[PDB]
Design an enzyme around this catalytic site. Structure first.
Site, mmCIF file in Angstrom:
data_model
loop_
_atom_site.group_PDB
_atom_site.id
_atom_site.type_symbol
_atom_site.label_atom_id
_atom_site.label_comp_id
_atom_site.label_asym_id
_atom_site.label_seq_id
_atom_site.Cartn_x
_atom_site.Cartn_y
_atom_site.Cartn_z
ATOM 1 N N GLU A 1 32.856 55.274 35.502
ATOM 2 C CA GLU A 1 33.068 54.076 34.724
ATOM 3 C C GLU A 1 31.660 53.603 34.446
ATOM 4 O OE1 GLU A 1 34.313 49.398 34.952
ATOM 5 O OE2 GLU A 1 35.751 50.840 35.793
ATOM 6 N N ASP B 1 40.987 39.869 39.934
ATOM 7 C CA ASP B 1 40.217 39.296 41.040
ATOM 8 C C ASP B 1 40.015 37.770 40.926
ATOM 9 O OD1 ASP B 1 39.809 41.786 42.253
ATOM 10 O OD2 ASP B 1 37.782 42.019 41.469
ATOM 11 N N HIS B 2 39.544 37.290 39.777
ATOM 12 C CA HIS B 2 39.285 35.864 39.631
ATOM 13 C C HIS B 2 40.477 34.936 39.790
ATOM 14 C CE1 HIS B 2 35.406 37.208 39.041
ATOM 15 N NE2 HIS B 2 35.069 36.611 37.911
ATOM 16 N N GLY C 1 37.911 41.931 33.306
ATOM 17 C CA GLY C 1 38.512 40.882 34.107
ATOM 18 C C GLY C 1 38.018 39.506 33.740
ATOM 19 N N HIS C 2 36.806 39.213 34.176
ATOM 20 C CA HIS C 2 36.230 37.908 33.955
ATOM 21 C C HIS C 2 36.483 37.175 32.630
ATOM 22 C CE1 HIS C 2 32.897 34.873 33.605
ATOM 23 N NE2 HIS C 2 33.579 34.488 34.670
ATOM 24 N N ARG D 1 36.594 38.217 49.995
ATOM 25 C CA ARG D 1 36.215 36.996 49.301
ATOM 26 C C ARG D 1 37.337 36.484 48.377
ATOM 27 N NH1 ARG D 1 31.829 36.874 48.766
ATOM 28 N NH2 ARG D 1 30.122 35.845 47.617
ATOM 29 N N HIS D 2 37.999 37.393 47.660
ATOM 30 C CA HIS D 2 39.077 36.981 46.773
ATOM 31 C C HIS D 2 40.350 37.745 47.071
ATOM 32 C CE1 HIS D 2 37.421 40.426 44.581
ATOM 33 N NE2 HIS D 2 36.437 39.730 44.038
ATOM 34 N N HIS E 1 33.081 46.358 32.543
ATOM 35 C CA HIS E 1 32.481 45.240 33.237
ATOM 36 C C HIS E 1 31.680 44.371 32.284
ATOM 37 C CE1 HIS E 1 30.329 43.062 36.449
ATOM 38 N NE2 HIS E 1 31.406 43.360 37.158
ATOM 39 N N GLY E 2 31.936 43.062 32.331
ATOM 40 C CA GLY E 2 31.241 42.122 31.470
ATOM 41 C C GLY E 2 31.655 42.040 30.003
ATOM 42 N N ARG F 1 40.682 27.139 47.668
ATOM 43 C CA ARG F 1 41.393 26.063 48.330
ATOM 44 C C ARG F 1 42.273 26.461 49.511
ATOM 45 N NH1 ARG F 1 39.099 21.664 46.777
ATOM 46 N NH2 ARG F 1 40.406 20.503 45.266
ATOM 47 N N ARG G 1 37.324 43.542 48.601
ATOM 48 C CA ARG G 1 35.998 43.412 49.195
ATOM 49 C C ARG G 1 36.021 43.437 50.719
ATOM 50 N NH1 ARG G 1 32.333 38.982 46.152
ATOM 51 N NH2 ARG G 1 31.216 39.354 48.123
ATOM 52 N N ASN H 1 41.456 43.238 35.418
ATOM 53 C CA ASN H 1 41.058 42.935 36.785
ATOM 54 C C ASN H 1 41.436 41.482 37.052
ATOM 55 O OD1 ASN H 1 39.344 41.813 38.900
ATOM 56 N ND2 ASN H 1 38.216 43.753 38.886
ATOM 57 N N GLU I 1 39.345 48.937 43.306
ATOM 58 C CA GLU I 1 37.886 49.002 43.339
ATOM 59 C C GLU I 1 37.497 48.746 44.791
ATOM 60 O OE1 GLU I 1 36.379 46.044 40.732
ATOM 61 O OE2 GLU I 1 36.383 47.400 38.993
ATOM 62 N N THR J 1 22.075 50.289 42.493
ATOM 63 C CA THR J 1 20.958 50.753 41.682
ATOM 64 C C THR J 1 20.211 49.515 41.187
ATOM 65 O OG1 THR J 1 21.984 52.823 40.939
ATOM 66 C CG2 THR J 1 20.377 51.804 39.458
ATOM 67 N N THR J 2 19.005 49.704 40.655
ATOM 68 C CA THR J 2 18.223 48.580 40.148
ATOM 69 C C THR J 2 18.880 48.021 38.879
ATOM 70 O OG1 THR J 2 16.701 49.741 38.627
ATOM 71 C CG2 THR J 2 16.205 49.851 40.990
ATOM 72 N N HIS K 1 39.669 44.446 43.310
ATOM 73 C CA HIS K 1 38.562 44.874 44.138
ATOM 74 C C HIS K 1 38.749 44.279 45.554
ATOM 75 C CE1 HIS K 1 33.882 44.819 44.802
ATOM 76 N NE2 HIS K 1 34.536 45.471 45.748
#
EC number: 2.6.99.2
Lengths: 242, 235, 235, 235, 242, 235, 242, 242
Positions: free
Chosen positions: H152, H10-11, H214-215, H50-51, H192-193, H19, H46, H8, H71, H101-102, H44
């Site tokens: 996923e 995205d970042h 990704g991150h 945002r990105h 993710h993560g 910038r 959005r 991913n 995504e 979800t919570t 993703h």
């Protein structure tokens, strides 16, 4: 033993001929490839001498540390050229419209007399022949019957596949064809059109002896350098059999 | 006095087109080059679209971080494209090898004006010939790019030093007439310095030799090396 | 003009011949060197074919992208080979250790005219001796290569500064006679700068120290480092 | 246990001795090799001191971080040197090309006991010959090293598969007699795997092909690649 | 000619002695450094043999391709050891409390008899002597008077400077001292405590012949590898004189 | 079954402390190691604070991305620090070389409990001795770290294979008692594999050899190599 | 003299905060940059702590081997943090609508009293202050009157130029502003928005003391790695002054 | 079979948007990743852009050599963009309070009708759909009932675990959820993560088809460069299945 990698350097010459200078030189690329994972070097000497030239073949024959695989059409000129060159391998491919099948491989089943004699003449010169053919049982049985010790299954359709299902179907056809080919005493190669993203499924086929790959490696090489491009491909191939 | 390098990526496309797949992609090569010493990217959109294609030109225009130098022949089709595309530079080329400007003053005069009205800086690809340079000046082009082909193809050190002197004189002549001067066709890692050392040179546009080195060493190093040799020459 | 570097790949063949295999191949080393800073490749075809062989010269002549400097003794066999081969340069050496030109004026004169007739630029390998230099100019050679061996083998810093001054004066003398001057035998990464700083030097032909560095670091880096040090000395 | 790699650095000295300088220094090459995949360093002290010298052995014995394999002929001089030096291993070789053990049982028996008395593990360099192997076991040697030269020089793939099978059977025979078995002479990057796959192999002692690769790519990479290929073959 | 770089490898041995094994070996580091920009290798043989040992000196003397600079105290043991070793250079440094000045250099002005004889004895053995001293005119004049051909100006205070002004003052003191030193026929070195961030101002001083640097290079090396650490330092030094 | 590598960076500090400056900084080495194959970082906070200091420990606790293994002696000062610092692991060490747990059951029993209440996983550094292992089990420690020092320092292949067998048996014994087992002291690039191959091994904590390789090749490569050899051994 | 490079690592924290994890860590970025050509590290502690945080500043202050340049808005909070932190440099920037200029620089002219106390307070703390302002004479005279030793000229407009002419105009404006500022006794920095393709013209301006650059370096780093990104920017800057 | 890696990027857009410049460009990141081990590229799009932006998606769709995994949240806008774009894959995620979800996964159980039409509509477009959900049986049964071919699993809770026990618990939960999902005919992804230190346990789960990460990769890239960051993550994943 382990799966072998033949590197086709034709496109080094296409880059060269685009301008008519001496660089880049296929001779340099062969050294780089042979020291980065190539077990053999392939060059297709075309009638129109579009990329590889007679000079390349002549020098390569003296500089290669491994062995040459001379790809060529089945014509009197090429046959004679091949006999005097004595490359370790010779891979017969279609040149004109009356040479190829509806998918691209050599028409062996429909030209048994020519193929039988080609195979015999090249064999007499001590060259191990491979017939480039479609993953078609009729052509495979014919390859065996005309006496060729190798066949190279054209993996283009598999590579060109436009959908997952279409690809899996083509993969299964190649796998079944390779198995049938081995049952006939043939040794089987493949490689045309393979890339860094679809090579593993082919390398995983147990009957594959050598994958002859060109374009995708050269295409990676202009970005990355030939050494890493060859090594990455060889690494993926061995992982697949792992 | 700060020599710029323009990298011609046409041959990345030549390699791609040889097989009809998407790789290697000129768009990738352009990012590599721009971050390895290229100050601009050059592409020649040919009529037969044999290497660079309209897709290439359309995407590069949106992905280049520096600027595009569109190499093209002087025809209504090409001018129209240029005008629409709005490349930063445009290098008029034929399709001794240079553009015959002195022999088509009217055509070139109108070409420069139209492109100039589209905000495009025009350069005319010409032989190191006083007649053509004057014509370039007269017709109004801001830039000329001296054909270094004969210099590159020289067979002996003598024929070479002679073509070199011809280019050096041609450059000083062009500059005395208000023109900015480029060069580059056929330059290699072994003959680029003598040309980079010419004071009047603004940008060298080089392609083939860089791509040829790249298939061996990778594009990033091929471009950084050429740029390093150029700055060494001025240094 | 920029100081040139000629790389002598003889010891690549020394390594090869110690076993009778085809590797390492001087042909590969030439490509590496030419792309890492070498402006020329030197090979010495010895009568005993200790290292470089006829095959080597034959193939190299066809694969070099720059030019060949054929080091050879002044004999009929070698002169014949040179004429046939047509290398761009020929460096005549003995079978201090420099060629005795001053005492074989007729022979050297015949050699130079003969090689020049084949379109070969001749260099006479001689000691930093003004008598030998004057003679080299007199017999028609366009180049001389000053033997830097004594400088390289200097046992003390005194003998070194002394040999350096001798080479530098000899060079200035040679240039005043219209000769172009090369050097390079025995130069290393630690003593090359003082020689490269001599203004009259045209090309430094170096071999052993580069190959000795290469077995450790690889040839590409060995060549680029030598070229870098040379250019640093000039600026 | 893992298959070991012994790197023979003799040709580093070959490169050095071709000029009489101190570089390249085998002592440096040993450090590089030991840190790039070598488990041992081999040097052959020839009577004529062609390459490795007494100085080399003397300093190496003090700088090696792994262990020394001293290749040497079975002579009084060499036996004395070995006893004095105390290398961890000693490989006895002739002054097919393997040692004639079966015909010099008394001499080899004396040699092995003498070296073993000095705390040295002895390896007899022999042909893949069961008569020679049985004799090696009989004279007390704990190791034999099978000559892979014939396999390496195989002219046809038939002669190759034939030599491979011969080596593999010989190895199994040697192990059944309690001998540990090494190999390695003449092995290259393209033929090492089939030998490394033989289960009974303990250590492969390779020299020439690694140094030949090194002059191009650098020693570190040359050694690590050989070790990598060896381990790939085992798994 | 160009500014030279001497690399002090003492800390390779400190890493070694911390555990008592053979690695890392100063002999390996010397090769790496000499091929990455070092023009000389420096080793300080201490009385307590804390890092460099007699074995290191003995082997180094045979393996160095350039030249050794033996740093040592002025005692009968070291002097004799130095005479038999014959390093190209010898740099006399303070060992105990009655050897150093209030800032760290050798006390030459206050021990002229010892220094004069040391210099003479080492010189007789063909060793070029350098006296490590503070950037103090009294010590410099004394160095010249006792016959030493070199002095090495202690750059520690400059390096330790705790403020910009304090640093510039120390720089100016070093620069003025070097000029005064050259006017007396002395050749001048420096280097102690120099880092990648403060070396250039010192390298720019025209009279400097060689900068002998250790710690910062080794400290960069553990992160980066010795080759790049030496090359980066040499690169900064040449840029400064550029 | 997935072997972890803990890198001890104490010697980075040793190098720093030798001169009193801030470099090289353990904090930097820890980021390098964690991104090159280290699964954890180990530091030994000694009473004399000769290498790692309280500052080091305080910053690393805030910068480590993986987790800290605090090596320390069993004293009230150290226990207090550990409790305050909350390192993920704690390795009780003395200050054959292992910790005498069997001889201080009371002290170690209280040590483990307190540290365990602080949420710290405790490992006792012991010799491969059945008496000590039982004591470790009895006192309640979750981990033991077998001292591989004697294995590392072995003088002959025989003494080595003997210490190896002793460690392998000791590990299986420890595991049969519910203990998780580590090792690592003194391991090098040449002896690490035999230890990594031991099934019961959970994490190998290695320091010195890695730092020693690093001064030559850089920490990143030194750590990645050690990790690669370890996974090869299990593979 | 020696043109310096300050690298702003804010965007490293940007990347991090996008997820609430601890990586990537600015502390690591700072070590990499300082050993690859950065002469200083810059961090902007925002009121909202959008990227760099108080821990970042607290740890960085202890791990930086060169020195810190703390960018911050002028408020009692920040001033106290700065006085507490004691960074070598402080660069005052705008953060709210009533602090910024119609160009993006700090409005010193419009807040002479506030800036005057800031500079004085920070100076008593031993901090060298720089006012981030536009290339405008009114702001420069103002910066000089209020007592700041440095100004950092906003190169953003130059960076965002759309035409070669627009760009030539902004460069000219910056070069004249730099000379003007120096004639008033100010030392001058620049840097915001500079890239690998426009840094040379700015670096060539003689009065420039340090270029503080961040964004383009991090953007290059994401592709090539931070070390080469910093080294390359430094190389371009020295070439310009060459 | 062959475990795939989707990267991913995205970042990369995150860094850029900070910038308003054009660099770094996600299009470049995608080429680097696809040639260093990525089998797919994930972006993703959005609602707030945002990105990643529409141009990013439009260009990427033309330059990707492998395939796109889009995504997006479930809205008529996004669905139309997806149907228009025709990416190979579509991963539906939550973006608003009434979609999540919570735990952070998509609430499929609570929106069966919406998801049902989404999956059907996207499927007619020839897009393979994946529902990003928690490792919860209710959501999995729901994903199966609504007709999605993939799910996923959200590995975030596993990634954020604070204790080895908490972590062991989450892994277990994911492994059982994967098996459960496969028993219902679903193919399963995760990612993710995940980081270089916790990816192996997930990669080892047999039912895993592709890990979309990704991150952590971008966070590593900022330091080492994207190519090595991707290659290293791929290597760790294959080792785990080894």
């Amino acid at each position: 033993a382990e799966l072998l990698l033949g590197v086709n350097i034709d496109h080094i010459a296409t880059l060269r001929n685009a301008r008519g200078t001496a660089y880049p030189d296929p001779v340099q690329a062969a050294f780089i490839a042979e020291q980065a994972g190539a077990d053999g070097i392939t060059v297709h000497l075309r009638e129109d001498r579009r990329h590889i030239t007679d000079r390349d073949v002549r020098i390569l024959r003296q500089t290669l540390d491994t062995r040459m695989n001379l790809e060529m059409a089945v014509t009197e000129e090429m046959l004679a050229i091949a006999v005097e060159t004595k490359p370790h391998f010779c891979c017969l491919v279609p040149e004109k419209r009356q040479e190829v099948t509806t998918e691209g491989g050599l028409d062996v089943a429909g030209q048994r007399d020519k193929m039988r004699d080609a195979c015999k003449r090249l064999a007499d010169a001590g060259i191990q022949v491979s017939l480039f053919i479609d993953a078609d049982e009729e052509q495979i049985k014919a390859a065996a019957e005309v006496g060729a010790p190798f066949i190279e299954i054209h993996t283009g359709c598999y590579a060109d596949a436009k959908t997952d299902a279409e690809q899996a179907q083509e993969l299964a056809r190649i796998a079944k064809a390779a198995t049938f080919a081995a049952s006939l005493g043939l040794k089987v190669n493949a490689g045309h059109g393979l890339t860094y993203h679809n090579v593993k499924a082919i390398a995983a086929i147990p009957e594959m002896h050598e994958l002859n790959i060109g374009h995708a490696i050269i295409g990676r090489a202009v970005m990355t350098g030939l050494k890493d491009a060859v090594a990455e491909m060889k690494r993926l191939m061995l992982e697949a059999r792992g």
